[PDB]
Paper text:
FlcD, an HDO from the opportunistic pathogen Pseudomonas aeruginosa, catalyzes the excision of an oxime carbon in the biosynthesis of the copper-containing antibiotic fluopsin C. We show that FlcD is a dioxygenase that catalyzes a four-electron oxidation. FlcD is a homodimer in each structure. Each monomer contains two domains: an N-terminal superhelical linker domain (IPR037061) and a C-terminal iron-binding domain (IPR016084). In contrast to quintessential HDOs, our data indicate that FlcD employs a mononuclear iron cofactor to catalyze a four-electron oxidation.
Iron anomalous difference maps extracted from our native data revealed that in all cases each monomer contains a single iron situated in the middle of the three core helices (α1, α2, α3), which are surrounded by four auxiliary helices. In the FlcD·Fe structure, Fe is coordinated by three residues that are part of the conserved iron-binding motif in other HDOs—E181 (α1), H191 (α1), and H274 (α3)—and three water molecules to form an octahedral geometry. This coordination is reminiscent of the 2-His-1-Glu/Asp facial triad in non-heme iron α-ketoglutarate (α-KG)-dependent enzymes but exhibits meridional geometry. E244 is located on α2 and aligns with the fourth residue of the metal-binding motif of other HDOs and, instead of coordinating a second iron, is within hydrogen-bonding distance to two of the iron-coordinating water molecules. V278 and R281, which replace the terminal two residues of the conserved metal-binding motif in other HDOs, are part of a loop that disrupts the α3 helix. A second iron is absent and the α2 helix is unfolded near the active site. A flexible α3 helix was also reported for UndA, BesC, and SznF;11,12,16,24 however, assembly of the metallocofactor is sufficient for folding of the α3 helix in SznF,24 whereas α3 folding in FlcD requires binding of both mononuclear iron and substrate.
Residue numbers in the entry:
A (entry chain A): 2 to 327
B (entry chain B): -1 to 247, 249 to 328
The structure:
């Protein structure tokens, strides 16, 4: 019952950096062991982002262990090591090089244009699944990966909550967390609603699930990095795409799962996300509106959004390839 | 501007005439080296050790630095500040009288030890409590009380959120999320408990400042300990403080009645009303987070050590408020 703890995951990685990280996470690890891990992780990430495919896979696997393991005794040092990797990653991402902050209208127009161009709804897999055309085995592929996107999303939102120093903005994220964790009934948290769906269609919903899909690991690593960033524009961009923009996927999948014979109660997970209300109309939009005049915020937000879309598209492409093969 | 940044780390550090304050500032630079950060950690640990071994100047200095590290609001330096804070926590926790139980107490014996400890640390009889409940406080003296209540209340929700982040079990994170929702005003952020308290302060002539910086040593000691406990990797420390703050406290009813008898309206004193509650601690839902962990002696030792330390720093804080209250009007 430690499958998603850091040391068992590191022991299963046949790489020298896994042993160095393990030593840095020991109870009496020295400052030098931790700095050594940080340096070798930063160099590994740099070599991988420069084109060494093996170093790339290796640093993504290690970053997955560092940022998303559940043994809280090592979390602070794990997050410290993860930041050494984030710093390299953010130097390599194409940055919104704006010199002057866009107008609020121009900023919104840029957002809508980028979303309309890179939205998950146009992917051939979205169309196929919404159509009702997935077989039971294909819906199992889809939902197995949905589990990984959903089951710990509330934790990433909580990291953003922690970094919103304004009490009213923390309150906005607290209202989100409250809804996401079931309001007064933890049985209806959105991870447990999805779990109920998975069990209804023959899958296990494992809260210690560990992903083996590279594109899924890359997606979760990026999402956790963005939501944890000290410049909250990164997290607000991802919050925006994950929760604020008109979801639309949830309603069409709900109809399709009921078409597939699941009951209304079993498919509740997709029902609860449906929402008519434009993104700027929502109250959480004020967290973004207030920061638009700041060009540093704009650059963080727009860079975050583009990177999120890149990793999300590669992830959806990989789910789709798996679905076509069953 | 200087006012807008007065609870940021670097402005606070530049006002601390401590050698180690410059070393911390260098460690917080955007491109600070691992050597600079390691040096700052070492110097802070040595300062904390010297203070806790009896050097009163080192004790005051390390506590001021820990206040800046753990509770400043410039998020850009927060991760390194918390990294440095832990070097201090490790020293602090070696010096705290800690429960050396060899095996776990029974549920009954655990509840009994908790209740006797809480009973024996009640402040219902404290001279300041009696002075305020009795009516006897002048307006200026009520202001002293509420000025410090502000520091206790206004960022409590953040400490609870650090505990939420460390509850890996989804149902337990949900329990803390329900607390946070209530604490941040449910659907109306104007009704968050800090803003209810701001309304009470405004009613009595005081400003409620969300960039407030404490200058009372016992108050700093209290906030430092509370943030340490809620952020601890062993959640027994946070559950101890959470339970004494939320599941047991049984205080707010008499302050509410005293304020109403002093001419404040129900709406002005709402901050105290919302806290009043009939239901025993075991009856509450959050108690399950504690009930599940009793069998684990490591949890019991963290929890009981945390409870005792919390009471020591809270009692010294309440004494210091009382001394200040008696210096006015
Ligand atoms: Fe949700
Ligand atoms: Fe409260």
């Amino acid at each position: 019952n430690t499958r998603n703890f850091s040391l068992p995951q590191l022991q299963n990685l046949p790489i020298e950096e896994a042993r160095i990280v393990a030593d840095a996470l020991a109870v009496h690890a020295t400052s030098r062991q931790i700095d050594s891990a940080a340096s070798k992780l930063a160099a590994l990430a740099e070599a991988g982002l420069k084109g060494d495919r093996q170093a790339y896979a290796a640093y993504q696997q290690l970053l997955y262990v560092l940022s998303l393991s559940d043994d809280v005794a090592t979390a602070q040092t794990r997050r410290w090591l993860a930041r050494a990797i984030y710093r390299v990653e953010e130097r390599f991402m194409p940055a919104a090089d704006l010199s002057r902050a866009l107008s609020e209208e121009d900023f919104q127009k840029r957002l809508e244009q980028e979303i309309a161009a890179q939205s998950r709804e146009r992917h051939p897999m979205s169309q196929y699944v919404f159509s009702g055309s997935a077989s039971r085995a294909q819906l199992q592929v889809f939902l197995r990966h949905q589990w990984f996107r959903t089951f710990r999303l509330y934790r990433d939102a909580a990291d953003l909550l922690v970094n919103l120093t304004d009490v009213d903005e923390a309150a906005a994220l607290a209202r989100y967390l409250y809804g996401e964790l079931g309001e007064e009934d933890e049985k209806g948290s959105h991870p447990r609603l999805l779990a109920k769906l998975l069990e209804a269609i023959g899958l296990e919903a494992d809260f210690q699930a560990v992903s083996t899909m590279p594109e899924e690991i890359a997606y979760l690593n990026n999402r956790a990095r963005a939501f944890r960033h000290a410049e909250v524009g990164w997290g607000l961009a991802v919050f925006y795409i994950t929760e604020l923009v008109v979801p639309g996927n949830h309603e069409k999948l709900y109809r399709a799962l009921l078409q597939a014979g699941l009951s209304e109660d079993q498919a509740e997970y997709y029902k609860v996300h449906i929402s008519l209300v434009p993104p700027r109309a929502k109250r959480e939009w004020q967290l973004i509106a207030r920061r638009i005049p700041d060009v540093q915020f704009q650059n963080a937000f727009l860079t975050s959004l583009s990177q999120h879309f890149r990793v999300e598209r590669a992830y959806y492409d990989a789910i789709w390839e798996e679905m076509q093969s069953v």
